[model samples]
Target: YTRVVWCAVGPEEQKKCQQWSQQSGQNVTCATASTTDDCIVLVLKGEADALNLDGGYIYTAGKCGLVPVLAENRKSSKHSSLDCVLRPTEGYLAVAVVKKANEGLTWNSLKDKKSCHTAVDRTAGWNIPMGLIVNQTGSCAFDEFFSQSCAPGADPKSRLCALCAGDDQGLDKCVPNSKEKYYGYTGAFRCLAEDVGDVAFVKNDTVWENTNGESTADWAKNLKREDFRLLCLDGTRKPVTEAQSCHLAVAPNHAVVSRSDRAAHVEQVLLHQQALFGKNGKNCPDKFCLFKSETKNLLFNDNTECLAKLGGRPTYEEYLGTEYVTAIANLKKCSLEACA
Candidate 1:
């Protein structure tokens, strides 16, 4: 009577979600939306029950009245005694990446530079970087700081979207969807690799995931890991391997969001659903794998280990962490229109 209806962000994710619903034997179902914002609207309108979201979007959803139910837990590089599900998250390392060849660029010199981002309202791409920038400059005009950019969710007519190249056919220019050529982690990194931007605001894992032919995409095929360097807030540049010491911020991982009325139900259902299709899940290969999506991240990130429970039933502010909430609050000072 109250099955959780997931809102997938695009056609590909919609197809993946349908598979998940089928493999789950009707335990859950799916709804499709054009973008993350639209998905949020679907949930708000009761057309969908819940969906997973990045920390930045979680802030937006939280401000709009949704509640965080579970956190995405991935495999820890450091050995920990606690099960992956119970381990406390340190969050991903958000960093400013630039080509090693572009030696002059440093964290101190980022003002009015060309930049690449996964999109607006993204944890690593937008919030962590822009939030910190706004806090540092004491100005709300982030657009003035970046001379040009491929910030996919910004207005298509604005400088923020000047670098956004649409799909292979040049269809969609600058929307939040993957149709934009410079969208998402790989795409943004791809943008930097092609010299479309001076710096790409992405996470530590992205550089590691797509370089040295680790990724099969033709654009990333010849990328060498050593060709890149991360800009440290201390105004120094370090190798990609030094991300832990050079990151911009430790951003909270993506999580599930739903109406307060459905929080408990959503959490309970997800626990059971992921048990069947999560990492090493019982029905994964034979039936469905919740975390795998033909190699692209689908309903949940591919790196996700499990949808773990939050310790204190944290409010969105508590869940996003203190410093992050503060930074977002500061960034939102003059972007009330952009908040939607």
Candidate 2:
């Protein structure tokens, strides 16, 4: 008689969750919310059982007592003989991207450059890069570092939001949703691609997926991999192909989270559910692919291969690693007066 209620953010995610609900025969159900935080509140109130979150959001949820139940194992870029569910996840690479034409730009020379970010508080787009900068520069006033930026979710009147071009209607400017033309990895990369910003903070997957005939989106239709470069922390620039060697930081993989009390049940139910809908699940492709959406990432990232169990008792802090948690804490201290 038990059922897991998944908190779905936004209408699109709710629709997909509804489909999943019907497909699961009510083993799972939906609780829709307008934002990720709202969904977290639902879980806190015991109205919802779980939701998947990125590293940054995970930080917030973890601090609020939610436990990470599984780590998302994505397709390995290198050959891995291990079954995804049994393999340890290496996580994803967060990199600073720029046009190769900007020959003088390097990690050391990035100050005062126009920047683009996926959104405020996102791991690859914001926390990893911005936290590194704040830590190295000994400052938290992002305004003084970048001349102008399109960091969605900042005050609409600030320079951080100056570069944001809202939806076709121009009403959602600086909002942290799809309506913001310069939001998320693809949008931030698009900003750098069109020369709207000097750099874009995104994951390595974005570089390969959106460049050199890999993506046919209107702006990325012709973005060749050779036309871009990554700024190494050592003050050098390298081709995107060298991301594993030259990148900002390794980000924690997105994972499903639930209240401490429901963590065990949520994990158990999800594993059993995926057995029927995951990549090689018995009914996948033939019935429903729980991991795939209408080409859009909904409940899970499009690249997620499987939800693997953690190797041991990893507290949220441990799973996020010492460096990441420290960096995020430092970056947030200036605002909350205490780390969130």
Candidate 3:
């Protein structure tokens, strides 16, 4: 088996890698300025037992430290055991779409089915820009590699969900509250709905009423405040007024306000999880009210059903921000080669 994956990183980090390679006995070479953009591709030819790099891409890269997508079958010529290092671009989100066609790996029929079509969704946070969405049958496997770092005592699966859900756990593993943490929403809930919709129960049916009915009153109260904040966060051009000073500017091209109607849908999933696992009595809310109540319902909705199609490919914006902007820029500079 062989694995070929693409990652983004800063250019300066790549040069240091070249220096480190020269210090070691292995035949390693890197090109920093060959590309016009600020990204450099690190190619490893021999079997590497271990490899490490800076930035979140390493953690998000599929099956880090194992399951080498580019050269899974490559073996160390000096020894029977197989091992090698992969030098990836630094700082950028690694957009890797692994193709696996292993013949001998076996499991029970159900496990085999799951193994053949598993995906990891890691959307969470405001900083981690929502980027590429990849999904496909067996495009990426969901094992421990994709799991999130647990809180002091939280369950790993919950931790992963929290990270994907923008919960405040997993602070030490990554940054405490950097904007980079937010990636995108997961598709698990929808998959659960389709797989077990009929049997799923309703955990909560909190009434969601439309507040837009009293437009005049709402305009004076909610809409005005919301608009004020929007102006402060997105229209960062002018000095912020008293009401909008604290918010981040909204993206000029993006929607000023996002609305949705996915509460009933998410409630369905929460009920399903509760029916199956609520007996455990973990304190976390099975369903997040914000996600369900948001006007746009962008976080989790019907599109979730198609998330399995994304094979870890960052969306177009993510590619531009992390890969093209940061990684490609670093690759252009011949001297600076440190992974972001």
Please report the candidate that would top lDDT against the real structure. Answer: 2
- The pairs that clash in candidate 2 are none
Segments of candidate 3 deviating more than 4 angstroms: 1-226, 231-308, 311-340
Looking at candidate 2, the ten consecutive residues that score lowest on lDDT are 331-340
Local accuracy of candidate 3 as per-residue lDDT tens digits, 109-179: 11212110111212211112112111112232322323232111123244333332222353332211111
Clashes of 2: 0
- State the lDDT of candidate 2 residue by residue for 100-205, as single tens digits: 9999898989888999998898999999888888879888786679999999889999999989998888887887766678877888998999999999999988
Candidate 1: residue 202 Cα off by (Å): 0.9
Give per-residue lDDT, candidate 3, residue 116. 8
TM-score attained by model 1: 0.94
For candidate 2, what's the RMSD?
Answer: 2.4
Candidate order (lDDT): 2, 1, 3
After TM-score superposition, the amount by which residue 313's alpha carbon in candidate 3 deviates from its true location, in angstroms, is 7.0
Roughly what TM-score does model 3 have, to 2 decimal places?
Answer: 0.19
Whole-model Cα lDDT of every candidate shown, in order: 0.86, 0.86, 0.22
